[PDB]
Amino acid sequence: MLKKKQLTVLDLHPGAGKTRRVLPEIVREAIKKRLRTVILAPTRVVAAEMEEALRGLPVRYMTTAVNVTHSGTEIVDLMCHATFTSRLLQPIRVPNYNLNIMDEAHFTDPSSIAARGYISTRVEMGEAAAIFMTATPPGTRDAFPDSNSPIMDTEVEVPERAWSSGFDWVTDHSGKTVWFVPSVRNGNEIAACLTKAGKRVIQLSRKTFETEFQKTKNQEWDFVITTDISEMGANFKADRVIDSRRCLKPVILDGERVILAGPMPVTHASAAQRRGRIGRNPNKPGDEYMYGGGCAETDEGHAHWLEARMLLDNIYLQDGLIASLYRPEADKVAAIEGEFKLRTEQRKTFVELMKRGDLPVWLAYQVASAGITYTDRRWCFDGTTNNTIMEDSVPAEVWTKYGEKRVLKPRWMDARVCSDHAALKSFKEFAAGKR
């Protein structure tokens, strides 16, 4: 695998030991061969699991998620997917790693797709080797891969709202269930219904994942209600997955606004990773997978791939060259390569709107490309009436940094800034000048 111009897809089935058995062997060989190596974890939670798998090996953990004291001599670095892409975008020296290892390489967040584009381009240029570790590479059509123990697969109507009757099989179960929902708001309603029926429910989403995931170890629970973030190496001691088989798809309409379309079917890769949370113990056959819909290739035209192009257009590669998306996922976007390349000052603004601003890539790009500076929030109030953001069925209002109460009506509307109460609170803080 470790030879230059090699990109290897390590596609062993979910639970086959890619992270705990194969990765340490790769890392040992990389150190022996004096390959400057990067390991990319999708989340802080996986970064901490990897330290356990790699324990004693000389690895520099470039994350506060890991409590270890470095020798200072490590030639292997570990960081999050998003951290790698962020550092590429910033005026920060990123080593031209000889070996690029991405764990949970199916992750479809913009920064992960962009990292795969950058890495696979460096491999294509003859500069580097890469290993992408995932059971579900891009365009996989197999929702039911092999498992450590047999799984009982059942197609069944799954509730997406509170229910009074008709789904006794949900609550009759005496084990532990991981339930994939399409959104935080949908999970909140199902969680309230289960809690009312006497169940102990933990909710997971991107923003809450590190705090709330610990509760799956520290408290007794009956259900985990999770968004798709639990597709990325989240492990549970569960015997059932309930899978809506639904997700939200961010869609750019008329190059002008982003909507959260759907819910709609998950990809085969997503379905396989959701199912793959169970069947992991060869001594516990008959874990159950209940699935409430079919799969479709809903990544086609999904905003994350356009946003990945916006990131890659702003990453230095060599002179004016621009990294391409990883070939198997390159047709998910129609973009002119280089169309989103910004001049130095607008790029710095773009980066700050994503990092400190916590804005979606697409929205950060609209603001930065308009020549607006990071702290100038006038655009949060001067949109068309149809861009009015709502709170409790009335237009949302903030006090501006000038002390004026104004309706929140952004010039560019991205549904992700108000998709749940937490998102709206954050965007209200942004519009008021509070970060």
Ligand X SMILES: NC(=O)N1CCN(C(=O)c2ccco2)CC1
Q: Which residues are annotated as a binding site for ATP?
A: 12-19
Given the DSSP bridges, would you call strands 394-395 and 257-265 parallel, antiparallel or unpaired? Answer: unpaired
Q: How far is CA 420 from CA 185, 390, 391, in A?
A: 6, 11, 10
- Which one of 32, 34, 64, 73 is in contact with ligand X (CB under 6 A)? 64
Q: How far is the CB of 95 from ligand X (least distance, A)?
A: 13
Provide the 3-class DSSP secondary structure of residue 313. coil
Question: Of 82-90, 101-109, 290-298, 412-420, which part binds ligand X (CB under 6 A)?
Answer: 82-90
Contact between 87 and ligand X per CB under 6 A: yes
Residues after which a C–N gap over 2.5 Å breaks the chain: none
Binding characters for ligand X, 192-221, by CB under 6 A (x = yes): ------------------------------
Contact between 79 and ligand X per CB under 6 A: yes
User: H-type helices in 75-221, by residue range?
Assistant: 81-89, 110-124, 168-172, 184-196, 209-218
Distance CA 220, CA 242 (A): 19
Distance CA 231, CA 104 (A): 9
Q: How far is the CB of 46 from ligand X (least distance, A)?
A: 15
Q: Distance between terminal CA atoms of the chain?
A: 45
Specify the residue, 65 or 269, whose C-beta has the smaller distance to ligand X. Answer: 65
Distance CA 296, CA 299 (A): 9
Contact between 63 and ligand X per CB under 6 A: yes
Question: Of 14-22, 61-69, 108-116, 183-191, which part binds ligand X (CB under 6 A)?
Answer: 61-69
Q: How far is the CB of 114 from ligand X (least distance, A)?
A: 15
Q: How far is the CB of 86 from ligand X (least distance, A)?
A: 6
Question: Of 80-88, 99-107, 308-316, 384-392, which part binds ligand X (CB under 6 A)?
Answer: 80-88
CA 323 to chain centre: 21
Contact between 355 and ligand X per CB under 6 A: no
Q: How far is the CB of 239 from ligand X (least distance, A)?
A: 36
Q: How far is the CB of 68 from ligand X (least distance, A)?
A: 9
Contact between 83 and ligand X per CB under 6 A: yes
Binding-site residues from annotation = 12-19
Half-sphere exposure of 291 (CA within 13 A, CB side): 23
- E-strand ranges in 306-374 read none
For binding to ligand X (CB under 6 A), which residues are involved?
62-64, 79, 83, 86-87
